[PDB]
Amino acid sequence: SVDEAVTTPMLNLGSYTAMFKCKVPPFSFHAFELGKMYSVESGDYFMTASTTELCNDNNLRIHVHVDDE
Amino acid sequence: SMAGHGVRKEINTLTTAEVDNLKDAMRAVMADHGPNGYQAIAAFHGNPPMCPMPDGKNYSCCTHGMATFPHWHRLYTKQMEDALTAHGARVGLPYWDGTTAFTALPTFVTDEEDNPFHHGHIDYLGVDTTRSPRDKLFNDPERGSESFFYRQVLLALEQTDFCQFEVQFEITHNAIHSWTGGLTPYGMSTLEYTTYDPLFWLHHANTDRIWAIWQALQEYRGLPYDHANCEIQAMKRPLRPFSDPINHNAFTHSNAKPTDVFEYSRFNFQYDNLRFHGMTIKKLEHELEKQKEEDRTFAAFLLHGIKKSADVSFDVCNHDGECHFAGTFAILGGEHEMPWSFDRLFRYDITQVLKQMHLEYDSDFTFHMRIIDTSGKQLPSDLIKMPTVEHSPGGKHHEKHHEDHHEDILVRKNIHSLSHHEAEELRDALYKLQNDESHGGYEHIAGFHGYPNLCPEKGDEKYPCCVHGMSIFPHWHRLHTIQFERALKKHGSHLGIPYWDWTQTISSLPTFFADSGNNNPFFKYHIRSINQDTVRDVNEAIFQQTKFGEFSSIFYLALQALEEDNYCDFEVQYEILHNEVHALIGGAEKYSMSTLEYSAFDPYFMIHHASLDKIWIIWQELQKRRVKPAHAGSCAGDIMHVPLHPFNYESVNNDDFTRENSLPNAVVDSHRFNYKYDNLNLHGHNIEELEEVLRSLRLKSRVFAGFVLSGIRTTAVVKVYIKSGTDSDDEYAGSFVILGGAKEMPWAYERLYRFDITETVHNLNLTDDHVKFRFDLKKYDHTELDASVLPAPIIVRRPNNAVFDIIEIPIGKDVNLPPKVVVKRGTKIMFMSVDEAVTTPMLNLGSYTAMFKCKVPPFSFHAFELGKMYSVESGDYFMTASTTELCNDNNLRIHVHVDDE
Amino acid sequence: GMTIKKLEHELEKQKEEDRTFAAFLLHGIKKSADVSFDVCNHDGECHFAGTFAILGGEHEMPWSFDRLFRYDITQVLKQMHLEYDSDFTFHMRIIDTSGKQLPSDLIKMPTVEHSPGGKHHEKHHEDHHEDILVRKNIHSLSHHEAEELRDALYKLQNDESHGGYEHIAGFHGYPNLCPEKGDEKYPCCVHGMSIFPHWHRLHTIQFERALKKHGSHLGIPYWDWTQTISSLPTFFADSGNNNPFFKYHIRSINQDTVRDVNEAIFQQTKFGEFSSIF
Ligand code: CUO
Ligand code: CUO
Ligand code: CUO
């Protein structure tokens, strides 16, 4: 949550790589990633900025991916 | 990768790659210690014994000598199959068609070295499996087809009744175990050991196949395939250990009950073909009936558990003492087997033997029976009761048959075939619904799709539940349509929602709507929530140039949908085709059918989606004929594994089917929803007939204009205009519509939108790869909007004969689009050298997404993409600008991706 | 009484209907006994399924039936209102002649079987004929039902006679009639009086009776306005198609019946403490 200026939203698994380009939906908080939280499930994930503009402020695109050993 | 089911095909048609995967997968399966291991699965069959009885006694789990027998084994085969798949097999156990004569055991099993199929180790025994085939195994044909396996199975097939069928079927099943295993202690001949041999699966796969063929025949007969009137009680009880929560496999666990077991499709595996021997199902039925014509004499046996496996042979003897070999049957068993006794007799066709004896039914002759154990020791005759002799005549008069149907089966009959009497139920049902404000009400049902937006759980954000543009787009709709229909039936409906085949030449709008007077409920509906009635601004949407191929207007698009292979590529064609109708009906109007947020309310809307749904069905199975089944998870499945909102959210129609079976994988099959269409035909063409028309398009090379459409957040139209060499004269290349609106959830077509420009381009005479680009103009329901986001058309040429290649020509410079996935492994790719200023380099697969950001190496031409070129290989690709700076000139990032159907 | 030909016909008729049977496997139980069994639903409610007897004794030769003995359960299930698919239990008691009970071990559990055949149900049935009239709910209204109301009202509205709509409405509002040639006029409408509902109740029937004479199937539809009001009834709202329910032309003075609807909505809570009308 570093930098209070940006809150906790951080979209989540926006979709696929194309979406990852920073497409985020109009305020539709497709919840998944919140404040201090955690997540057990596997598969392919992703994290994008809370808002479309908020994305461009630092390019919050990190595409987390979670596979097997 | 095939999207659909793990298919099981014949063993004799072994494809090297397939065999390799199976061997490897099996090897891994054998190795794993886990509960979904080879040893663990094998254990289910018998030793070590997995079943508890309430006394604590342990017995072999397999159900034999019972009606449940095919059900239990069906699950067992699947259990092993799932394991192999996890291991990486292309899904499916191969089936060994034992029925047909074969010189030797399948090579697949036979190969001694590096073959996991050859044998398996038995941990408890501490020895490997063994097999000693009996020579009797290759049955001697009189006819050539006339073999014992064939005959035994054939008799089973003839039986109408499930129970009658099962006994014959099961006994036949046993024959393979005996002959293969023979005397050896470790093999198939023993109940305990059999699961260990890998051949076991091949055999059971075949046995399951036999059952499947029978079901198909029953369906053909019109007799119930899924359920059995007999042994009602047995079906209900679960088959352990599958029912146990210990069971790692969810699917088998879910279909623990024999009632559940019947539907194989739920199992998610299919067979390459039902055809028994060469015969088709239709043919087989005919063949069977012929047998009926002649009288036959049978010997009947009552069999019970004789604590062991044994082979019985009996001969028919005349008083003279002359005898001939009557026949053989086998019993599979062992110690710790569960007790079983057949409810009915096992029938064996004596007729040939009697004729040879020249005996008559009435004549007094004797049956001699000898029971031999596997060891060769003779058993006492006390084990089996003396056989009965019966005569079966041939012919019939006034045979009233009893085949049940219509538990909850509705049918959506054509609006045209509609009758005055039929029409009333529709009007009444709809009206009663419309007046209904409850959660079940019409006002509420329409609400799911358009405004007001519900689905997020008290988000207070709102959210259009309407899923458009997603891969799921038809899935959500198909369920919604049924939701509308189901609501009506509860309201008092006789028939299903009428569907309209708008593809055919449209003389005028349906009378169903047009009759605005008499307060027709189908014509419009009062929102009541906000107010305002459902109005529509009809468009011409007519003028007929030509039918039966090259049909101008809607049909081509729809026909174009069926044309497309793969689901993912299909869905786009599916939606866009659907998108068109909404526009003509809704027109410009605020509250119209064209307005996504509102269109749900319109009466036509509820029915209209049904008409589209019909197209999906024809296509769904149509693909199956193609040996490319694609329904369920195919390419972009991830979206599917999540329930359709708001159907799952607690506040739906509360329809038990809907609320529960909201899952997309479930919705894929319409037959579950309890409704059927009066016909499969489109534009007056039957499935086989229509398939021909499709062939016509493949006949001629056509150039297509690729489109990467992304959520505009509004519904609108686009006019594609092709530039001309002369001045710049545009041309009406055509037009398509993009549905959407205000705060809709974001969407973007992963797949390209095939749009046919061909004739238009030829006039101007330009080349697909060569400098060819066009500027379209798009427009909102009424007014102009930013044409800007094209995004730049990605020309694709679809070669004529020898298709399913598809060529994809992206572009070079001033290109605009995210990662486009042509998919359809085997597709071809290229690039447009448009703008001489930029040469041919275009990096290639730079690396991963991070690299895609435009990292390109210093002049290191990591070759891959050149000038006019192509590429067959699959996997994930990419294309970036030749140089780092050259990237920024137009953002040449297109991340091509190429997966499987 | 039946002849052979007749009997065969009688038997076939039985075949026509589906039946459910319980099957018993019987073997020598070294004695004579009477067996009675009941069908019970899960509830534990039971009904007497049926009875059969076994004749036997010591030194009887051993015997076992090759097939099951069938007993027709169908009537019992219907009484239970059980379905074949439904899960129910069969309870069996074996009593010897002496009255001593035998162990159930002697007989194996019964099997159940289904016999044909089914059909599709057409909605052939007819409910009540117009005996007495009934004022059915406006909501429960059907399209077909709706027409009779519109037709009946319309025919009345066009009717100027004393029986006419213009006249019936006249009783309550203007013009005022009731005093016998008082030339005073007088609103017949009785409001505020103790009789207030009495006069109205009769007037309402007067309206309804006028319609039936005019050609009505059903009674005047009533609207339960207390319940949360989503919107005005469709019956009125459909101003188009010249809906007779929406408005009426006075014709006497002129001017159509217009209404200035008020919000009359917003729902706070139902089922007690209902705000507004209820
Ligand atoms: O059935 Cu248990 O063995 Cu093939
Ligand atoms: O799909 Cu939601 O509209 Cu036809
Ligand atoms: O008006 Cu006279 O009563 Cu309601």
From Swiss-Prot, chain A:
Biotechnological exploitation: Potent immunogen used classically as a carrier protein for haptens and more recently in human vaccines and for immunotherapy of bladder cancer.
UniProt tissue specificity: Hemolymph.
Top-rank taxon, per record: Eukaryota
Places the protein is found: Secreted, Extracellular space
PTM annotation: Probably N-glycosylated. The didecamer is almost evenly tagged by a total of 120 sugar trees.
Disulfide linkage: C22-C55
Domain notes: The protein is composed of 8 globular functional units (a->h), forming a 'pearl chain'. Each unit is separated from the next by a linker. Since the lengths but not the exact positions are known, lengths are indicated here in free text. Linker lengths in amino acids are: 20 (a->b), 13 (b->c), 19 (c->d), 16 (d->e), 14 (e->f), 17 (f->g), and 17 (g->h).
Family in the record: Belongs to the tyrosinase family. Hemocyanin subfamily.
Quaternary data: Homo-didecamer, with two decamers assembled face-to-face at their open ends. This didecamer form a stable 25 nM cylinder wall.
Function: Hemocyanins are copper-containing oxygen carriers occurring freely dissolved in the hemolymph of many mollusks and arthropods.
Protein name: Hemocyanin 1
Organism whose genome encodes this protein: Megathura crenulata
Parent sequence residues shown: 3346 to 3414 of 3414
Swiss-Prot record, chain C:
Entry PTM: Probably N-glycosylated. The didecamer is almost evenly tagged by a total of 120 sugar trees.
Chain sites annotated for binding Cu cation 15: H172, H191, H200
Tissue-specificity statement: Hemolymph.
Subunit structure: Homo-didecamer, with two decamers assembled face-to-face at their open ends. This didecamer form a stable 25 nM cylinder wall.
Protein task: Hemocyanins are copper-containing oxygen carriers occurring freely dissolved in the hemolymph of many mollusks and arthropods.
Family from the record: Belongs to the tyrosinase family. Hemocyanin subfamily.
Free-text note on domains in this protein's UniProt record: The protein is composed of 8 globular functional units (a->h), forming a 'pearl chain'. Each unit is separated from the next by a linker. Since the lengths but not the exact positions are known, lengths are indicated here in free text. Linker lengths in amino acids are: 20 (a->b), 13 (b->c), 19 (c->d), 16 (d->e), 14 (e->f), 17 (f->g), and 17 (g->h).
Name listed for the protein in its UniProt record: Hemocyanin 1
